[PDB]
Amino acid sequence: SSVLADALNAINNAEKTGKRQVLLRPSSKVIIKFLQVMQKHGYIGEFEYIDDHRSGKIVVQLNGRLNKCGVISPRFNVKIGDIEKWTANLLPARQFGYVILTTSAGIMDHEEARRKHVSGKILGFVY
Amino acid sequence: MDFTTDKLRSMVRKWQTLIEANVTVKTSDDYVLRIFAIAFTRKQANQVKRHSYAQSSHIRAIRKVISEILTKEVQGSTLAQLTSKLIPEVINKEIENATKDI
Amino acid sequence: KGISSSAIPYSRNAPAWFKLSSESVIEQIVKYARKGLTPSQIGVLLRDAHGVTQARVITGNKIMRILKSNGLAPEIPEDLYYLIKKAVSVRKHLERNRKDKDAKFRLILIESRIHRLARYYRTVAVLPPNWKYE
RNA sequence: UGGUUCUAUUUUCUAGGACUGAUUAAUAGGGACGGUCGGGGGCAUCAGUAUUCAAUUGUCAGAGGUGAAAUUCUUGGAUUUAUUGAAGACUAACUACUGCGAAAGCAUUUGCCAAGGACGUUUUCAUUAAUCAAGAACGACCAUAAACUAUGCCGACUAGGGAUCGGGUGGUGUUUUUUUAAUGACCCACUCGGCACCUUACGAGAACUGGGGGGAGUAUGGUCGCAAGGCUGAAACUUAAAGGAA
């Protein structure tokens, strides 16, 4: 499996089982930015990067507000004009959740990406 | 010499191991004897697990010392000396004392 | 599959009781290698008796780099060499007695494992291409 | 390894020159080491008592076998008993919701040959990795059985609980014991890995080949079949003997 996918799988089903903390290993910059944007929108609480010298561990604390993480496995390019279409086709509803993209300006959600007018490849979603 | 069958059927119980050995030894006369041995793995007092099995290397080591010390009890006996030795069951006490280390 | 490996400490320093020299360790390393031990054996002897924890920490670099920079390079990597000699030991067992179908099966497994990392080492070109396992 | 020449006391010490230059170290993977572990395999060896057969006694009329019998053996002594030999198998009880093996499978001892797993590791290499269509390995003589009542909700999934097998660490009591080597057994806690068992919480879990259409019945002016009569002999013959029936 991937390295973002099993971290998001742990952070998904741990919250489904109703835990208040996940430990996810290993940890990359893209995982830090994904948890960064989802705590910017308020889906997880704090999280902490314990640096062992191998790859890093994250302890996320998460309350109740998430209900699905994911990754879109072909990292196809989206456009600023088709951000609205891709959110319509993969989100649950109209203003429900965020598609998260790797852009020129880094990892951002879809509405921040179209706010500062930059497209990029898709990464994953959260709602 | 031979046991009755009811004695060793009365000795065999499950949840233990029987270590049995045999050696073909020539005495201080020129009688050659096939002499056997049976032993059953006890459980200690305060043992709470129900098994008391030997770990089969303890079986090989116990069977080794059984063979060595009873082939030391023969060759160091004649037939009359060996018979007077195994009437009061004292080769069994030699095996027990030599094997309680294992 | 079991989890039984070694747990490298978080420290990357000499342990502050290691009063030996960073060069006398290298001299002991090349002495043991020239008297003929594989690098894993150098590491375990150095760890057990002359208490360097690990020599990538205490010396500069790892000990196969120390041996290659001091002139004691291996003909073939240690993994491939040990798997090669295990495969040829099983092959001589099989020529001795030819009803050991289980040992034939383990020879197929060992030969597959030979080809895997021989392919890896060949594409890295540690060892030259056109290398065959005889 | 070779060669040139510079300083002060017959031999002391000296200076120079020609044959490397990115990270970790995955509760990913491999390899080494260590004490081990197992009814894993191969070869050799050893033993056991049955069975079958044979030899020798002892004694005499039956012995098998069956629901009863019978084929069979038997006064040229069967069966039973005792001593001994030979053969081919097999490894009883110990034997387990235990172990090992990739599966089929594997149970006597001892030795050799290689192998394997788990654990321990402040050893080593450094991405060498995961899945499977294809393909490969294992699976003229003496003649043989397999299934046959069964079960369960699946996975990418949380925690446990008791018991057990292999390793390790710690404790500090009893069996052990001593100046010959090392080495146990049990109790307890922790921990890793297994064969199972008893529970829990939470998820879309979608996108050796050939097949008609439910279960239980009912009817049939259709089609294809099979089937009745009536004493036999005995019909062209009112017909014998004998038999049947009552």
Swiss-Prot record, chain A:
- Source organism superkingdom: Eukaryota
Q: Per the record, GO CC terms?
A: cytosol; cytosolic small ribosomal subunit
Task: Cite the entry's keywords alphabetically.
Answer: Cytoplasm, Ribonucleoprotein, Ribosomal protein
Q: Which GO terms describe its molecular function?
A: structural constituent of ribosome
Cell compartment(s), UniProt: Cytoplasm
Give the disulfide map: none
One GO term of the biological process aspect: cytoplasmic translation
Q: How does it assemble?
A: Component of the small ribosomal subunit (SSU). Mature yeast ribosomes consist of a small (40S) and a large (60S) subunit. The 40S small subunit contains 1 molecule of ribosomal RNA (18S rRNA) and 33 different proteins (encoded by 57 genes). The large 60S subunit contains 3 rRNA molecules (25S, 5.8S and 5S rRNA) and 46 different proteins (encoded by 81 genes).
**Additional facts recorded:** Present with 19700 molecules/cell in log phase SD medium. There are 2 genes for uS8 in yeast.
The family assignment reads: Belongs to the universal ribosomal protein uS8 family.
Report the function annotation for this chain: Component of the ribosome, a large ribonucleoprotein complex responsible for the synthesis of proteins in the cell. The small ribosomal subunit (SSU) binds messenger RNAs (mRNAs) and translates the encoded message by selecting cognate aminoacyl-transfer RNA (tRNA) molecules. The large subunit (LSU) contains the ribosomal catalytic site termed the peptidyl transferase center (PTC), which catalyzes the formation of peptide bonds, thereby polymerizing the amino acids delivered by tRNAs into a polypeptide chain.
Name-wise, this protein is Small ribosomal subunit protein uS8B
Curated annotation (Swiss-Prot), chain B:
Using the record for this protein, list the coiled-coil segments as residue ranges, or answer none.
none
* Maturation and modification: N-terminally acetylated by acetyltransferase NatA.
**Full-protein residues shown:** 103 to 204 of 255
Question: What further note is attached to this protein's record?
Answer: Present with 92400 molecules/cell in log phase SD medium. There are 2 genes for eS1 in yeast.
Subunit architecture: Component of the small ribosomal subunit (SSU). Mature yeast ribosomes consist of a small (40S) and a large (60S) subunit. The 40S small subunit contains 1 molecule of ribosomal RNA (18S rRNA) and 33 different proteins (encoded by 57 genes). The large 60S subunit contains 3 rRNA molecules (25S, 5.8S and 5S rRNA) and 46 different proteins (encoded by 81 genes). eS1 interacts directly with uS11 and eS26, which form part of the mRNA exit tunnel.
Q: Where in the cell is it found?
A: Cytoplasm
What's the gene?
RPS1A
Which family does this protein fall into?
Belongs to the eukaryotic ribosomal protein eS1 family.
Task: Please state what the protein is called.
Answer: Small ribosomal subunit protein eS1A
* Function of the protein: Component of the ribosome, a large ribonucleoprotein complex responsible for the synthesis of proteins in the cell. The small ribosomal subunit (SSU) binds messenger RNAs (mRNAs) and translates the encoded message by selecting cognate aminoacyl-transfer RNA (tRNA) molecules. The large subunit (LSU) contains the ribosomal catalytic site termed the peptidyl transferase center (PTC), which catalyzes the formation of peptide bonds, thereby polymerizing the amino acids delivered by tRNAs into a polypeptide chain.
Curated annotation (Swiss-Prot), chain C:
GO-annotated biological processes: cytoplasmic translation; maturation of SSU-rRNA from tricistronic rRNA transcript (SSU-rRNA, 5.8S rRNA, LSU-rRNA)
Q: Does the keyword Protein biosynthesis apply?
A: no
Q: Which domain of life is it from?
A: Eukaryota
Which UniProt key words apply to this protein?
Answer: Cytoplasm, Isopeptide bond, Phosphoprotein, Ribonucleoprotein, Ribosomal protein, Ubl conjugation
Cross-link position per record: Glycyl lysine isopeptide (Lys-Gly) (interchain with G-Cter in ubiquitin)? 31, 35
Q: Which GO cellular component does the record give, naming just one?
A: nucleolus
Instruction: Please list the residues that carry the modification Phosphoserine.
Output: 24
Which PROSITE patterns does the record match to this protein? RIBOSOMAL_S15
UniProt-annotated location(s):
Cytoplasm
- Spell out the molecular function terms from Gene Ontology: small ribosomal subunit rRNA binding; structural constituent of ribosome
| HAMAP family, A to Z | Ribosomal_uS15_A
- Give the record's subunit note: Component of the small ribosomal subunit (SSU). Mature yeast ribosomes consist of a small (40S) and a large (60S) subunit. The 40S small subunit contains 1 molecule of ribosomal RNA (18S rRNA) and 33 different proteins (encoded by 57 genes). The large 60S subunit contains 3 rRNA molecules (25S, 5.8S and 5S rRNA) and 46 different proteins (encoded by 81 genes).
The task this protein performs is described as: Component of the ribosome, a large ribonucleoprotein complex responsible for the synthesis of proteins in the cell. The small ribosomal subunit (SSU) binds messenger RNAs (mRNAs) and translates the encoded message by selecting cognate aminoacyl-transfer RNA (tRNA) molecules. The large subunit (LSU) contains the ribosomal catalytic site termed the peptidyl transferase center (PTC), which catalyzes the formation of peptide bonds, thereby polymerizing the amino acids delivered by tRNAs into a polypeptide chain.
Which protein is depicted? Answer: Small ribosomal subunit protein uS15
Lineage here is: Eukaryota, Fungi, Dikarya, Ascomycota, Saccharomycotina
Which gene is annotated as encoding this protein in its UniProt record? RPS13
